[PDB]
Structure 1
Amino acid sequence: SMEQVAMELRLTELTRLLRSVLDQLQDKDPARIFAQPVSLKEVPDYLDHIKHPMDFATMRKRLEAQGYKNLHEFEEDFDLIIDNCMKYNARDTVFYRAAVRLRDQGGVVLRQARREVDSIG
């Protein structure tokens, strides 16, 4: 149907926008602390601790299969990356501190993206 196509034009535009957002957010992690999932080989207990792991590459796989239906869903995943990190790691670590910085730097990007999504539908 033509109604179905039009939903698909909008999903595809959402995806284009969210790719820009994701790159912008990944630049706030120059150390690439959040680029890949935590290794179970290198942290075998990780799933005893964190129930929903998340990382930029897993967000990117989802994004390219147009699996984000809106910005809330994408914002939940981004917040997982930060929130998992601040639980697992202690306050005085390079990992926690990188989360805080990503959160603060990310919140700006996400403040304007929420306006660009509302603004352009």
Structure 2
Amino acid sequence: SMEQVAMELRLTELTRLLRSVLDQLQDKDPARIFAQPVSLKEVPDYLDHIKHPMDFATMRKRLEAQGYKNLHEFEEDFDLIIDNCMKYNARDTVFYRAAVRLRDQGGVVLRQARREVDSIG
């Protein structure tokens, strides 16, 4: 139906936005802590700590399938990269200190993404 096709193009334009939002946040992590899912060969106890792992590659695979139906679903995953990192890794670690700065600089993008999905609809 034409109502379904108008629904699908709207998703197709959200995805384009959430890609460009995704591209912007990964620049804030330039040396790539959060590029990849934590290796369960290098970190065999990780799933004892963190029940919902996330990373930019996982977020990009979800995105290109059109699996982000809104901006809230995208933010939960971005938040999960920051949040899981800041629990596993301690404060004097650069990992926590890299997660902190992605949050802080990623806020100015997620504020300036919230009001982009919005009116665009």
TM-score (norm 2): 0.99
Task: Report the alpha carbon displacement of residue 29 of structure 1 after superposing the two structures with TM.
Answer: 0.2
Instruction: Structure 2: state its 5+ residue gaps.
Output: none
Deviations 1:45-73 (A, max 9, x none): 00000000000000000000000000000
Count of paired positions = 121
In 1, Cα distance between equivalents of 2:89 and 2:119: 38
Residue 27 (1) aligns with residue 27 (2) = yes
TM-score (norm 1): 0.99
Deviations 1:76-95 (A, max 9, x none): 00000000000000000010
Report the equivalent of 1:73. Answer: 73
Task: Report the alpha carbon displacement of residue 31 of structure 1 after superposing the two structures with TM.
Answer: 1.2
Task: Report the alpha carbon displacement of residue 4 of structure 1 after superposing the two structures with TM.
Answer: 0.3
Identity, % of aligned positions: 100
Over 3 Å off, 4+ runs: none
Q: What is the Cα-based RMSD across aligned positions, in Å?
A: 0.4
Instruction: Structure 1: state its 5+ residue gaps.
Output: none
In 2, Cα distance between equivalents of 1:4 and 1:54: 31
In 2, Cα distance between equivalents of 1:96 and 1:73: 23
Task: Report the alpha carbon displacement of residue 119 of structure 1 after superposing the two structures with TM.
Answer: 1.9
